[PDB]
Subunit: 206 residues, 5 copies
């Protein structure tokens, strides 16, 4: 019985995993949302600030679809992010390699939906000057696909408000506002427009 | 003695046979087939308390225990082999994660687990962790108080359930010469809902009260 | 249909990659790599060790006959993205780094049907620089060469589309402002070897804001 | 003959490593690992965190029947060097480390025809130590235990050749001088397990030069 | 093309060499090897007087020769040599004996093999090693030394040789915090009371001061 549930899952996974990424003819849309945990450090000597957050990522591939009834009513499953394609979303203004704080495992559901929530620590270019005043300091960093134009990967948010509800209450810095906004930008390298979600944080000393 | 040397050879052959048989992977737990992970903490040292960033550094090891049917075997079929140590990469392990780390955890111990014939698995990773903590008052008689939650990152309370044996973090190995003394340390199972997921997730809350020695 | 384009792309990649791997350039079959720099930030200048840390991305471009395909055979697919591990990439290396380069970006390249390849790794580099004068109107000047480590100019040759480093993306709040940034192809002779090595010399003049 | 010596050695390694594969020690077939330490340097003593950083060589010796061979069948080859990854190695772990150890030497071991292995990894270790007193004539005393993480004494037992740490490579110019260094086998129980675990206790007494 | 045949030959060569036969077991007493070694010193980056560690940037030139890497160019379309990944071949275990940190690799690991079985390999490294920099702010400067050599092979298996005993300073960074008074690289033979076999290292001695 409980073996039957396993047999069906191993079945489903084996049937499935036997994807070249998106293209202009097969475009993929990624929904991004940020949950900001902490502003760990603000370095005025280098103008770098360190964030800890979660990035929620959602997209859909028909190549991931299946009929639950054939697979014993299995709606969804966890799998290693290595077992599937995942999008290349990248901070455009990092000063160091992002460090991954959580297991890389995604949830795949029968309709082809994939949901993935990497927690990360990020050092990025920010000038904290004013962080000790009432107005505080403002910094911004864009997140987007590195190699994929708007014609291939589109970016969406469900809300322009960063989720602050997990922000660390004892942080050295308190958040005044945090917004996540979709943008369309052009770059020297390429004629095609690239999409980003601009994360803007306004913060000050506690 | 030829017999004794033949005996040792047989045990080896028996062990390899057992390992090859079992490793011919388990998909992970499901709402249909939930799994309970037992968890306890042994706190060795509070290495550093950084009042400039509100990050605190711990060294500890977590005992993880769980049980799987697919890891069961009859010892009499395998020459009285009750248990074996095996690389942790060889088997499924739980994704237990600090919820409030500021840096990737650094692994201080070999990752190898003990598997027993009833399907029991024991695993004790030792770790150094930076997590979010305000050590204000650490220099005071009552010291400072910090907390960090550990639980599965991707599996709700319907897939992975957590339990402790005791609510006392084990202090018997705590470094006597540490810069910080422990006023107390407890480990408590909790149930919480998070915005991303409708299902409740379980964590074990490590709460530590400490001050400068 | 979108299934077909997907089927065609997978087929195209299996044909190009599974049919071994280009062993690299040779005296018989040399290769020109085009290089250009986009300077995002001067993060840190350490006057105690004389190391400066740059954040930049490096555009690299080259072309291999063995990467060509006829689009009409493969669905009029004119190009694709592929992981940089699936193809040969040039060994371009800073000659005066003090630390291993840190990669800030996904490593994925764009291959085109004419066989051209385009790749843009973003990197943080610590290199040897004396920031003395950085506090003055004139500022400080430093230079670092980028070139193949193992391939002389009979094997790999280097080219720039301009001698002007791209500052369009330079961080406006950086501790350091850039006075000038140039990138210049050099034919460099080393007494170790009979054959010249080719590099692109990056020269940055900068000062505290 | 050079090909023959080479050919014999390749055959030997193939015979050994393709043979029916030691799954590691068990209670039925326990193992004694001999451990000795050669202290190179005390690099750093941090009194703000109570950590101390040590550089040292750890000599490890054990013997497996499954590694035995007759030199005669193999051209009188007595011993060979092999990658440490080609064989089983013990899990010896420092019990008090505050950071993952950093390996300073290649991982290659020597295997001799009696089944003996000799493996000497060089390491930099940060471990828990209170430096207090280091600046006095008495100096400071610190201790760290090394033993198997996952194997009880019924599976792995330890021994030393001497109670005396080898000080012959200790760096003459170190910020710290060594007053005494000992290495002593201990037996110990831990909350986790009924079985005793064996460790070798490294005790160092030191002060500022 | 003829450029197409060039690729086929090279590939044919590399396969015949690398795929064919057993992996080179490494040198032995019966089949000993000589490694030639030289240092080009680029920079003294840092001198820490609180830990007595000094950080060097340099590249090493390593050369050795193996019969198992030989080929006749005529057989192979007259290719006299090629570049190959260092993972494709055996490389020597040359190691600093007095380092305090894992060496950091600054250069692509790729070596050049020539038809006579000769290999040249030029790793660039940043190395922290035990050095007391005391006197660096004086006129006579500081002197430090570090030995390099095989970790696991005695003089009977691996022998070391230098082309010159002068460290190459021609590439030294002229704006370095530290200026070099002298740098030498000298072969040394050591014996240990236990054993008749010699042990071989190249001793790098550097005298330097604040610029
Ligand atoms: C692998 O290594 C082994 C062991 O070292 C070598 O085997 C030995 O080979 C040497 C060289 O032939 C042999 O040395 C000879 O010993 C003879 C007497 O041996 C007898 O008695 C012994 C026991 O004491 C028995 O084990 C053995 O079977 C015999 O019954 C001497 O009479 C020889 O001396 C004469 O010859 C030498 C030159 O060979 C002259 O210089 C002397 O002046 C004299 O005329 C000789 O010294 C030895 O016996 C072998 N040992 C065994 C046990 O076999 C292998 O050769 C080696 N394989 C290699 C290197 O390929
Ligand atoms: C001509 N041409 C194209 O049309 C599309 C390319 O797409 C692939 C790509 C694009 N980028 C960059 C990374 C960073 C910088 C600007 C933007 C696009 N960015 C912010 C996301 N990195 N890889 C391309 C890549 C290299 C050379 C020419 C190219
Ligand atoms: C809609 N939805 C689900 O119903 C269940 C999911 O479960 C998998 C999962 C859950 N989490 C988080 C990681 C961190 C934050 C909250 C909690 C759960 N947490 C503390 C462990 N990360 N991945 C899920 C994942 C991504 C997007 C939508 C989802
Ligand atoms: C004579 N000869 C060769 O022609 C090519 C060699 O290999 C290619 C190579 C070259 N370099 C270095 C890297 C850096 C520093 C100086 C120059 C040459 N550089 C700027 C490109 N590193 N690897 C080689 C290797 C050892 C001995 C003689 C050699
Ligand atoms: C009941 N039981 C056993 O009998 C044997 C086990 O052996 C495997 C093991 C044991 N340790 C620890 C690591 C550290 C701390 C105590 C000691 C043993 N230590 C100093 C070496 N690490 N892995 C075991 C593991 C987890 C839970 C119960 C167990
Ligand atoms: C008896 N015996 C041998 O004859 C040869 C061995 O060769 C392997 C080896 C030797 N070394 C060290 C590293 C450093 C310090 C001394 C020298 C030899 N060193 C400078 C190269 N590191 N690995 C060996 C290894 C372990 C136990 C006994 C041994
Ligand atoms: C190689 O060079 C030789 C000259 O010695 C020439 O005869 C030959 O045609 C060339 N190529 C081959 C494959 O022999």
């Amino acid at each position: 019985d409980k073996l039957h549930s396993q047999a069906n899952l191993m079945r489903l996974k084996s049937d499935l995993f036997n994807y070249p990424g998106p293209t202009k003819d097969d475009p993929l849309t990624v929904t991004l949302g940020f949950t900001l945990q902490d502003i760990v450090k603000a370095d005025s000597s280098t103008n770098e600030v360190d964030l800890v957050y979660y990035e929620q990522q959602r997209w859909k591939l028909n190549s991931l679809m299946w009929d639950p009834n054939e697979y014993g009513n299995i709606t969804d499953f966890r799998t290693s992010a290595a077992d599937i394609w995942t999008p290349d979303i990248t901070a455009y203004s990092s000063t160091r390699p992002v460090q991954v704080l959580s297991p890389q495992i995604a949830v795949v559901t029968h309709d082809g939906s994939v949901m993935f929530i990497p927690a990360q620590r990020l050092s990025f270019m920010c000038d904290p000057t004013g962080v000790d005043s009432e107005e505080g300091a403002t910094c911004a960093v864009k997140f987007g696909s590195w190699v994929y134009s708007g014609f291939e990967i589109d970016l969406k948010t469900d809300t322009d408000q960063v989720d602050l509800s997990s922000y660390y209450a004892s942080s050295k810095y308190e958040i005044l506002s945090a917004t996540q906004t979709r943008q369309v930008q052009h770059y020297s390298c390429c004629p095609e427009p690239y999409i980003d979600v601009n994360l803007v944080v306004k913060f000050r000393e506690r």
